[PDB]
Amino acid sequence: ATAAEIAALPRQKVELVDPPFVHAHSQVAEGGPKVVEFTMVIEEKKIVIDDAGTEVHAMAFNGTVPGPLMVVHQDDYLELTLINPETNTLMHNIDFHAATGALGGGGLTEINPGEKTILRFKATKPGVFVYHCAPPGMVPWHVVSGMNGAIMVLPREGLHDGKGKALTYDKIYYVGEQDFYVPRDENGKYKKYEAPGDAYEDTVKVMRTLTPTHVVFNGAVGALTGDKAMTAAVGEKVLIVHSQANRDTRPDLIGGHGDYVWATGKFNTPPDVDQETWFIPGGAAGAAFYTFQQPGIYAYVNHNLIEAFELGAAAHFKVTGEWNDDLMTSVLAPSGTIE
Amino acid sequence: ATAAEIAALPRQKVELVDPPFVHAHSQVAEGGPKVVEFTMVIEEKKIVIDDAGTEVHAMAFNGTVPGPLMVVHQDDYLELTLINPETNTLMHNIDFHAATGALGGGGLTEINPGEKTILRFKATKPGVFVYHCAPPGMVPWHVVSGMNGAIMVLPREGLHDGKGKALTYDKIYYVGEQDFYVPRDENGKYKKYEAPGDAYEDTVKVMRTLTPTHVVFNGAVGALTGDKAMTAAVGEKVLIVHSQANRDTRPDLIGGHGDYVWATGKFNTPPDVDQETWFIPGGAAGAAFYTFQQPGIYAYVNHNLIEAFELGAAAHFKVTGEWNDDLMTSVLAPSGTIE
Amino acid sequence: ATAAEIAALPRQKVELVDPPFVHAHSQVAEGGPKVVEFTMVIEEKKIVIDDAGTEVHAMAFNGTVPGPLMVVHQDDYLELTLINPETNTLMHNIDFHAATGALGGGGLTEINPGEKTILRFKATKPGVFVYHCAPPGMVPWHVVSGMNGAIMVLPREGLHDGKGKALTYDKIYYVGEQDFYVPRDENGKYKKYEAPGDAYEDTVKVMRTLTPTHVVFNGAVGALTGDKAMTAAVGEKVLIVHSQANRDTRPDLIGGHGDYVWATGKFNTPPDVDQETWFIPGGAAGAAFYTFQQPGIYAYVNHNLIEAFELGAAAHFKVTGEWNDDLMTSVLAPSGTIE
Ligand SMILES: [Cu+2]
Ligand SMILES: [Cu+2]
Ligand SMILES: [Cu+2]
Ligand SMILES: [Cu+2]
Ligand SMILES: [Cu+2]
Ligand SMILES: [Cu+2]
């Protein structure tokens, strides 16, 4: 398309919402291609990632970890206004794996504190894609400090299964998984720092052991458990978007399954079906579609159970509805053996 | 199905056998849905996992690591009687990834020493699935202490390749891969403990380094080598079921291939073909089908060669038959260069 | 085929070239099956793997790490002459994952210094396959010392996408990824040794931590960056072969995508499409096909960004051509926020 053609396309401004929720959108595209505008501010701030008061200097898109999920349709243009406040201390940029050229946009979006930039790219490929900050020479540090998220480029005709059958979800949640590498003092206690830069050296040596100290969903251990559990009802169709910008993960819905899973996250690649545990390599986003059949609590985890229950990668789903005894029943409840 | 309908279905009681063997079953289902009864006892006992006398307090279904493979057909009901002897010291339960609801059954099967429970669930999805103990608050510990296995839910019409061609195996073996995390004293020597609970704290800190001390097949280094090698003959079709309840693995049959591989372990997802090394994420089971064409010894390994040959993840297949020189021949046997 | 039939087949001798380049070949097979002869010498030599002067005693096929890529077509016979010079100190052999029988050929090719052997095998399965040295009792050590490479068995009719469409590449590059485990003294400085064998013990204990000290492409940090960047032009179709004989990797072309990816590396398994990051398990080779649409520098990395930018797994592609503003444009270049 020529510049004049792109300029005459209708524009839509979107208000981003905090994860795990997603901004309003239509699954089946309404009309022709559009220019969809998003605005994100970068916040460098301290966040507590566990119940022991462990602090980390996060670098967050819109103040959250992960950054929000942006949704567009194939062949729409995504136009991002990215702002780095004058109160921040580092240069940041953004690389959209959904984009083509200039290191995903990272080469055209380097902004220092007090600057802003506007980048536009055509969403030519459908699927879920990771986006993350990637400043030359400090790439892994910004990513493992939480500066990453994901976008979803829906096919214009909505989601479909392997054989053309339409798949419409009632709800969608975005689970961003993050590996943190927090330094510990000579006593095995987590260290705290005044400013982001002061933690760099120590963090890098923890990073080189390739063993995270924490692995969490939505920025903190237990962030999506208890009162913050994700919800659904029996009969509802849910799409769960999962991203990991740096490290492998293996999602599994305990008590349920992955009816249709685009483990690689690309909609033109047929989904795998009836999955128990799927695999998302570091540097990618994946999506699973499931229709709940039983009520109760479900645990959604990284199925390396140590990472899930010892490091923090575990979330809850609270589902309402009626129990189905055909699918599962307790014939004899736990009781003492009668001698 | 109503309760009265399930009650009128024919019942079949199955006697489980120790891995790597599998109980007798038919590939193509005989008739309509059935209620298939299995019984498993939980044994807490010390096992030696290597040739250095290294001991571990295993928590084993039917006394083996892995627990046995249970086989049913799609839409059959699996009814398990689970028993926790009064001589055990911990509460245990079971989560079937093949099941729908109540955390895979874990929420309905918590039994203390001296108790039993009976759980029934409909096997709605075909494929190989992991099952494991998962007590609230102590999930990874029971899993890495060996309390896991797998089940196979065969399609009613038997196995088929991507394009409807029937696949009938002559033999089937179940390889359970286990990651152990054994504590070491100040001298680098493995520690021993009186009771399961006494090893908990030390084991947990080894678990957090995410680096196992041992990675074995059938519960011990060399468990499936030498005289215990799995067997086959040239021309025979073999199905190899592989499970890993907590950690990723990458199976590879050295000297052979994976003609058809359901790496994700789900039969409704077409198999990948002609595989050299496949990948099974932690929290899943996979299956590979191969027709032997050459006699001799084959090594079946986790292809991270350090885990295979240094940590213990290596097994043997001894195959009888005649050598095929068309496929491979030594034109010039190793000999001194003639100067 | 009988011996007389194989003996009457035409023969072709191939001169191997150093990675990342590949020897001349035709994508679509010219005529019938052939016997393709390759010759490789084994070199035990010291190589420097980073800019800090870190040395390693490599064991290299044809003196390079990885060894060269050999190309044949399905049903051709590959006949390898393998030579172990009298000046080497260890016995070596070779296991072709592309081969059937005798541990991939390893059981028929054990040669001591001063010996040679000739092995022939029929390339029955199409795809990219790893090959590596595997001497009994010292398998992982030879592999992580660099003795591995890959071969490509092209379908006789050339590459095709999932639905029969022909895929013809203009260029092909072979990226061999290697994990090294270099011992460090009491001061955290890399140790040096006189002979291969003298480093064995120390290396093995680093290997058991399963954490490499370096992860590189083409044998050294930065080996494929700067002036040694791989090249292409906008509009050109490139096939990138990637292998990892021992450890998992997750390739990603920063700024681009994987239009068609045989992540498992087997051509009879349909490719995944529009990939951002794909996964190649240790013990396998994979291939990605991409058509460049934008000029500039691209980074090709293992997308665990710590392994890429801290450990060495990063390469460059320099692409010439004209920028396409439809795909991506800087609407507002980084500039100060106007207050
Ligand atoms: Cu940043
Ligand atoms: Cu589980
Ligand atoms: Cu238990
Ligand atoms: Cu191998
Ligand atoms: Cu060697
Ligand atoms: Cu990236």
Q: Where do the domains of chain A lie, and which CATH numbers do they carry?
A: 8-155 (2.60.40.420), 156-322 (2.60.40.420)
CB C71 within 8 A of CB C23: yes
Nearest CA in chain A to C296: A102
CB atoms within 10 A of CB C166: 11
Give every strand in the sheet of C272-275, ordered side by side: C214-217, C171-180, C237-244, C284-291, C258-262, C272-275
Please give the Cα distance from C104 to C98 (Å, whole number).
7
Please give the Cα distance from A285 to A249 (Å, whole number).
10
In sequence order, which residues have a C-beta less than 8 Å from that of residue B272 and are 6 or more positions away? Answer: B258, B260, B261, B263, B278, C264, C266, C269
Backbone phi, psi, residue A49, to 5°: -100, -5
Resolution (A): 1.7
Contacts of B294 in chain C (CB under 8 A): 100-102
Cross-chain CB nearest to C115 (options B323, B327, B337)? B337
- The long-range contacts involving A189-196, CB below 8 angstroms and separated by at least 24 positions, are A190/A52, A190/A54, A190/A55, A192/A55, A193/A57, A195/A57, A195/A89, A196/A44, A196/A57, A196/A59, A196/A89, A196/A90, A196/A145
Contacts of B337 in chain C (CB under 8 A): 83, 86, 114-116
Backbone phi, psi, residue A204, to 5°: -60, -40
Please give the Cα distance from C7 to C203 (Å, whole number).
45
The ligand minimizing its distance to the Cα of C82 is 5
Burial code (b: 16+ CB inside 10 Å, e: under 16) for A297-323 equals ebbbbbbbbbbbbbbbbbbbbbbeeee
Nearest CA in chain C to B300: C103
N residues, chain A: 339
Please give the Cα distance from A223 to A244 (Å, whole number).
16
Contact C124 B327 (CB under 8 A): yes
C296 touching B (Cβ < 8 Å): no
Cross-chain CB nearest to C122 (options B276, B327, B336)? B327
Q: Would you give the DSSP letter of residue A227?
A: G
Burial code (b: 16+ CB inside 10 Å, e: under 16) for B57-93 equals bbbbbbebbbbbbbbbbbbbbbbbebbbeeebebbbb
Q: Would you give the DSSP letter of residue C215?
A: E
CB A124 within 8 A of CB A77: no
Contact B108 A325 (CB under 8 A): no
Distance of CA C309 to the CA centre of its chain: 19
Please give the Cα distance from A191 to A56 (Å, whole number).
9
Residue of A253, A306, A320 for testing the chain B interface, max B β-carbons within 10 Å: A306
* Helix intervals (H) in chain A: 3-7, 139-143, 196-207, 305-309
Please give the Cα distance from A44 to A60 (Å, whole number).
6
Please give the Cα distance from A101 to A108 (Å, whole number).
10
Helix, coil or strand: residue C274 = strand
CB B303 within 8 A of CB C148: no
CB B233 within 8 A of CB B319: yes
Q: Number of helices (H) and strands (E), helices first, in chain C?
A: 4, 20
Contact C100 B327 (CB under 8 A): yes
Amino acid, single-letter form, for residue A305: L
Distance of CA B137 to the CA centre of its chain: 24
Backbone phi, psi, residue B227, to 5°: -70, -20
In sequence order, which residues have a C-beta less than 8 Å from that of residue B190 and are 6 or more positions away? Answer: B52, B54, B55, B182, B183, B184, B213
CB atoms within 10 A of CB C305: 28
Helix, coil or strand: residue B230 = strand
Reported in sequence order, the residue ranges of A276-320 that DSSP labels E, i.e. its strands, are: 284-291, 296-302, 314-320
Please give the Cα distance from C45 to C60 (Å, whole number).
8
Pick the closest to residue C335 from B222, A50, B303, A118 (CA basis).
A118
Contact B119 A328 (CB under 8 A): yes
B214 is in an annotated binding site: no
Put simply, the chain B residues between 311 and 330 with a CB less than 8 A from any chain A CB are: none
The tokens of B75 are what?
């839409």
In sequence order, which residues have a C-beta less than 8 Å from that of residue B164 and are 6 or more positions away? Answer: none
In sequence order, which residues have a C-beta less than 8 Å from that of residue A281 and are 6 or more positions away? Answer: A244, A248, C250, C277, C278, C279, C303
The experimental method behind these coordinates is X-ray
The ligand minimizing its distance to the Cα of A104 is 6
Residue indicated by tokens 């002609």: B274
Task: Please return the burial class of B217, using the count of CB atoms within 10 Å of its CB with bins 0-12, 13-18 and 19+.
Answer: buried
Residue A104, phi-psi category: left (phi > 0), alpha (psi -120 to 50), beta (remainder):
left
Q: Is the dihedral of CA A318, A319, A323, A329 positive or negative?
A: negative
Greatest pairwise CA separation for chain A in angstroms: 86
B73 is in an annotated binding site: no
Q: Is the previous residue joined to B251 through a cis bond, with omega within 30 degrees of 0?
A: no
Burial code (b: 16+ CB inside 10 Å, e: under 16) for A119-141 equals bbbbbbbbbbbbbbbbbeebbbb
Nearest CA in chain B to C117: B334
Contact A254 B111 (CB under 8 A): no
Amino acid, single-letter form, for residue B77: Y
User: For residue C225, how many C-alpha atoms fall within 13 Å in the half-sphere facing its CB?
Assistant: 16
Beta-bridged to residue C56, according to DSSP, are C47
Residue indicated by tokens 């819905």: A253
Nearest CA in chain B to A323: B101
Pick the closest to residue B16 from B54, B53, B64 (CA basis).
B64
Cross-chain CB nearest to A275 (options B110, B112, B264)? B264
Helix, coil or strand: residue A105 = helix
Helix, coil or strand: residue A83 = strand
Q: Would you give the DSSP letter of residue B161?
A: -
Please give the Cα distance from A228 to C314 (Å, whole number).
40
C248 touching B (Cβ < 8 Å): yes
Please give the Cα distance from C250 to C276 (Å, whole number).
10
Give the CA angle between residues A334, A335, B2 to the nearest 5°. Answer: 55
Helix, coil or strand: residue B105 = helix
Pick the closest to residue A149 from A294, A29, A23 (CA basis).
A23
Q: Is the dihedral of CA B87, B90, B91, B92 positive or negative?
A: negative
Pick the closest to residue C97 from B233, B258, B307 (CA basis).
B258
CB A135 within 8 A of CB A142: yes
**How far is A158 from chain B, CA to nearest CA, in Å?**
22
Helix (H) or strand (E) run with residue B176 in it: strand B171-180
Distances, alpha carbon A71 to alpha carbons A158, A284, B281, B298, C331, in Å:
12, 16, 29, 50, 20
B208 touching A (Cβ < 8 Å): yes
Beta-bridged to residue B81, according to DSSP, are B39, B118
Please give the Cα distance from B150 to B148 (Å, whole number).
7
* Helix intervals (H) in A251-325: 305-309
Greatest pairwise CA separation for chain C in angstroms: 86
Please give the Cα distance from A108 to B54 (Å, whole number).
57
The ligand minimizing its distance to the Cα of A142 is 1
In sequence order, which residues have a C-beta less than 8 Å from that of residue C206 and are 6 or more positions away? Answer: C181, C182, C183, C213
Please give the Cα distance from A75 to C334 (Å, whole number).
25
Pick the closest to residue C268 from C169, C154, C171 (CA basis).
C154
CB B144 within 8 A of CB B179: yes
C130 touching B (Cβ < 8 Å): yes
Helix, coil or strand: residue A308 = helix
Burial code (b: 16+ CB inside 10 Å, e: under 16) for B282-295 equals bbbbbbbbbbbbbb
Chains near B with 3+ CB pairs less than 8 A apart are A, C
Contact A276 B97 (CB under 8 A): yes
CB atoms within 10 A of CB C325: 15
| DSSP-assigned letters across all residues of C107-160 | TT--B-TTEEEEEEEE--S-EEEEEE---TT-HHHHHTTT-EEEEEEE-TT--B
Helix, coil or strand: residue C103 = helix
Helix, strand, coil share of chain B (percent; to 5): 10, 40, 50
Interval between CA A114 and ligand 1 midpoint (Å): 14
Nearest CA in chain C to A181: C306
CB A251 within 8 A of CB A174: no
Query: For chains A and B, what is the number of CB pairs under 8 angstroms?
Result: 170
Q: Number of helices (H) and strands (E), helices first, in chain B?
A: 4, 20
Distances, alpha carbon C60 to alpha carbons B50, C45, C94, C149, C225, in Å:
33, 8, 12, 9, 22
The tokens of B52 are what?
């250095």
Residue of A35, A76, A211, A269 for testing the chain C interface, max C β-carbons within 10 Å: A269
Please give the Cα distance from C124 to B290 (Å, whole number).
14
Distances, alpha carbon B140 to alpha carbons A304, B79, B136, B200, C338, in Å:
8, 25, 10, 11, 54
Amino acid, single-letter form, for residue C42: I
Put simply, the chain B residues between 70 and 89 with a CB less than 8 A from any chain C CB are: none
Backbone phi, psi, residue C223, to 5°: -55, -30
Amino acid, single-letter form, for residue C110: E
Contacts of C210 in chain B (CB under 8 A): 211, 304, 306-307
Pick the closest to residue A247 from A152, A312, A178 (CA basis).
A178
Residue of C234, C294, C305, C330 for testing the chain A interface, max A β-carbons within 10 Å: C305
